[PDB]
């Protein structure tokens, strides 16, 4: 729609102006800039869609429900940021990869401080069910130097799609950290990653259901890599051929992070001579760290 | 400062999120989600939000979420201090001739207020200067609206609404019916400024932005009548220093009224000391 009269347009515009000038005294000029931009976009959204009072109530309830479900592990506001692409966008603006630097992507909620320490050629599965997957590669800097003693945190879901922290028996599984060797090398046994849904029993899940979207993530293994003077890398690698690669629920996929997970025959000869019942896979991931 | 390549990367991400909603069954939900996506990313890309700022914003929402309702509603208060509540009111109470402008209720409206007769007193034990309020309720063609139900509520001299006390008292709160000529009047209290709840993240945001939680002095009204568009509104005090810094943007120029201190015979004959009087003519649009 119904055409907004000039009088009515003028009233709405006057209000946006009142809100913007409310921030004029803000002491930190970046905070001021952020709050004024937030104002303009929030009011532009409201005035574009002509939000109704019932719709406003719905949004308020949504936020409130997200507040009530958010706790020590579960972070519904971060999941909302994830499914709206705001997390990936914020990573993209702050982590432009120059030269050969590995691309960054979403962190998620399932990183735990204090992961067990393994050696190269060790095994992060720690009880977790899944097909054995051998992961290897090299850490270098953007000048091509191997980087020994870079800290490599790795974590992933098991075959039922759960991170160890999601269980209630304080188990540790499918996570560890290791340190790159003298030639920058790292390797470990893990499990072949498979798709799982993000937490979807809260408001974010309701919004996904109402919009006909899926909570499912494309298969991945997480990596967080740190080294002195290097920009910390938060990333994961995806599985080439995975049908979810174009519909990841948190838009975390980048082509350069998709890796060939190569299935090996049952009985095929294994790194370190490990004995395996049936198939196993292997994947290579070379990591390049940029300057801080 | 943003490369061609980086700009394309950012816009393509926005495009992918917009396309993720293409199967939503309800066309209005789909429209709202796509608009919300566009404006959110436009914000992010305009300020180049840092990961630190993103964390601060999430922590802020989280802290608000843990304030938790039963009079205390921090997301509503956040909507209020960002002007989103008053914008929603405006768009849903559009201009219609000289129909009185609407506002939010705020958190202190109470069902079951006491009935007074026109000329009665709403104070009911509340401290403050007596204030005579009078006027007429008409429609947008100027016809008096008889038997319109007028609710009024306000804070006392200490800036508290009756329900904020621990004793179940009723004060500075009532309703009455307009007369055959649309006329209404009652004794109330000359309103003074008080703060919105400021011990939560809303308060923290206001402090960090140099903003005061103080409300400009006001009386609240709700007016209903068969066939008329219900009005929820405030009136404010001409010359109040706070008029251009109301913390929840309740103030409209049109709702500012002249509260004239007297010195001086009382309407309807009571006690004395100083007293103020105000005229408020109310105009209701069609439902
Ligand atoms: C900053 C706080 C101010 C709050 C302003 C209100 C926010 C406005 C967005 C809300 C619009 C939702 C409209 C619902 C459409 C119809 C409907 O009810 O669908 C139902 C589910 O709707 C939904 O799926 C709700 C999704 C809403 C997500 C809101 C995110 C908030 C981000 C901050 C705001 C900027 C079906 O079940
Ligand atoms: C829209 C909901 C989906 C989730 C995505 C949201 C992601 C976060 C976006 C919010 C951006 C807020 C950034 C604040 C900037 C902080 C800053 O500049 O410095 C800090 C200043 O200290 C401060 O006190 C900052 C005050 C915090 C501002 C409140 C944010 C209001 C959020 C409204 C969201 C509307 C939906 C620390 O120093
Ligand atoms: Cl815009
Ligand atoms: Cu916008
Ligand atoms: Fe994950
Ligand atoms: Fe009030």
The whole-angstrom separation of Cα B16 and Cα A249 is 11
d(CA A111, CA B43): 28
Quickly tell me which residue has 């519909």 as its tokens: A247
Total tally of structural domains belonging to chain B: 1
Asked whether the beta carbons of A77 and B62 are under 8 A apart, the reply is yes
B79–A56 C-beta distance less than 8 A: yes
> Is the four-CA dihedral A176, A179, A184, A186 of positive or negative sign?
negative
- Is A55 within 8 Å of B32 when comparing Cβ atoms? yes
Q: According to the annotation, is A196 in a ligand binding site?
A: yes
Tokens at A241, concatenated: 């051929």
DSSP states of A147-206: -TT-EEEEE---TTS--GGGSSS----SEEEEE--TTSEEEEEEE----EEPP-SSHHHH
Residue B10 φ/ψ, nearest 5 degrees: -70, -45
The encoded tokens of residue B68 equal: 């938790």
Minimum-distance CB partner of B90 among A15, A89, A251: A15
A77–B69 CB contact, under 8 Å? no
A37 CA distance to ligand 2 middle (Å): 11
d(CA B2, CA B10): 10
- How far apart CA B211 and CA B209 sit, in angstroms, is 5
Cα–Cα distance for residue pair B160/A2, rounded to 1 Å: 41
- Residue with structure tokens 């006057």? A14
Cβ atoms of A190 and A135 within 8 Å: the answer is: yes
Experimental method: X-ray
Find the DSSP H helices in B66-97.
Answer: 74-81, 84-92
Q: Mutual orientation of helices B51-65 and A53-69 as an angle, nearest 10°? A: 100
Q: Report the separation in Å between the CA atom of A87 and the middle of ligand 5, taken as the mean of its atom positions.
A: 14
Domain that holds residue B117: 1-287
Q: Which of A19, A33, A38 to mutate to test the pocket of ligand 2 (most atoms within 8 A of CB)?
A: A38
Q: Report how far residue B135's alpha carbon sits from residue B145's, in angstroms, rounded to the nearest whole number.
A: 12
Using an 8 Å CB-CB cutoff, list chain B residues near A53: 88-89, 92
Question: CA-CA distance, A145 to A184, in Å (whole number)?
Answer: 8
Cα A81 from Cα A90, distance rounded (Å):
10
Query: Which residue has the least CA distance to atom 26 on ligand 1?
Result: A207
> Do B51 and A88 lie within an 8 Å CB cutoff?
no
Count Cβ neighbours within 10 Å for each residue of B260-281 and write b for 16 or more, e otherwise.
eeeeeeeeeeeeeeebbbbebe
Q: A193 C-alpha to center of ligand 5: Å?
A: 9
Q: Could you tell me which of B61, B244, B1 has the C-alpha nearest to residue A76?
A: B61
Q: Mutation test of ligand 2: which of B42, B60, B64, B207 has the most ligand atoms closer than 8 Å to its C-beta? A: B60
Cβ pair A177, A153 in contact under 8 A: yes
Provide the resolution (angstroms): 1.8
Q: How many CB pairs under 8 A join A and B?
A: 204
Give the one of A15, A41, A89 whose C-beta lies nearest to B13's C-beta.
A89
For residue B230, count CB atoms less than 10 angstroms from its CB and return exposed for 0-12, middle for 13-18, buried for 19 or more: middle
Q: Could you give the 3-state DSSP secondary structure of residue A48?
A: helix
Which pair of structure tokens corresponds to residue A261?
């997970």
B15: CATH = 2.60.130.10
Rounded Cα distance, A51 and B32, in Å: 8
């Amino acid at each position: 729609s119904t055409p907004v009269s000039a009088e009515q347009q003028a009233r709405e515009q006057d209000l946006v102006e009142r809100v913007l000038r409310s921030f004029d005294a803000t002491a930190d000029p970046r905070l001021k800039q952020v709050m004024q931009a937030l104002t303009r976009h929030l009011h532009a959204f409201l005035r574009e869609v002509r939000l109704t009072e019932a719709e406003w109530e719905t949004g308020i309830g949504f936020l409130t429900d997200a507040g009530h479900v958010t706790n020590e592990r579960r972070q519904e506001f971060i999941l909302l940021s994830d499914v709206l692409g705001a997390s990936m966008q914020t990573i993209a603006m702050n982590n432009e990869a120059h030269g050969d630097a590995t691309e960054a992507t979403v962190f998620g909620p399932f990183f735990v401080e204090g992961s067990p320490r393994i050696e190269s050629g060790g095994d992060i599965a720690g009880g977790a069910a899944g097909e054995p997957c051998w992961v290897e590669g090299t850490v270098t800097d953007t000048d091509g130097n191997p980087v020994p003693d870079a800290r490599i945190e790795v974590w992933e879901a098991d075959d039922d799609g759960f991170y160890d922290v999601q269980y209630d028996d304080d188990r540790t599984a499918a996570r560890a950290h290791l340190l790159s060797g003298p030639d920058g090398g790292y390797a470990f046994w893990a499990i072949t990653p498979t798709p799982y849904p993000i937490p979807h029993d809260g408001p974010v899940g309701r919004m996904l259901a109402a919009t006909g979207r899926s909570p499912m993530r494309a298969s991945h293994l997480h990596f967080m890599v740190t080294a002195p003077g290097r920009r910390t890398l938060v990333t994961h690698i995806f599985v080439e051929g995975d049908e979810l690669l174009d519909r990841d629920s948190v838009f975390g996929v980048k082509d350069s992070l998709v890796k060939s997970f190569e299935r090996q025959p049952a009985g095929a000869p294994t790194p370190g001579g490990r004995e395996i019942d049936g198939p196993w896979s292997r994947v290579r991931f070379d990591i390049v760290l940029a300057p801080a």
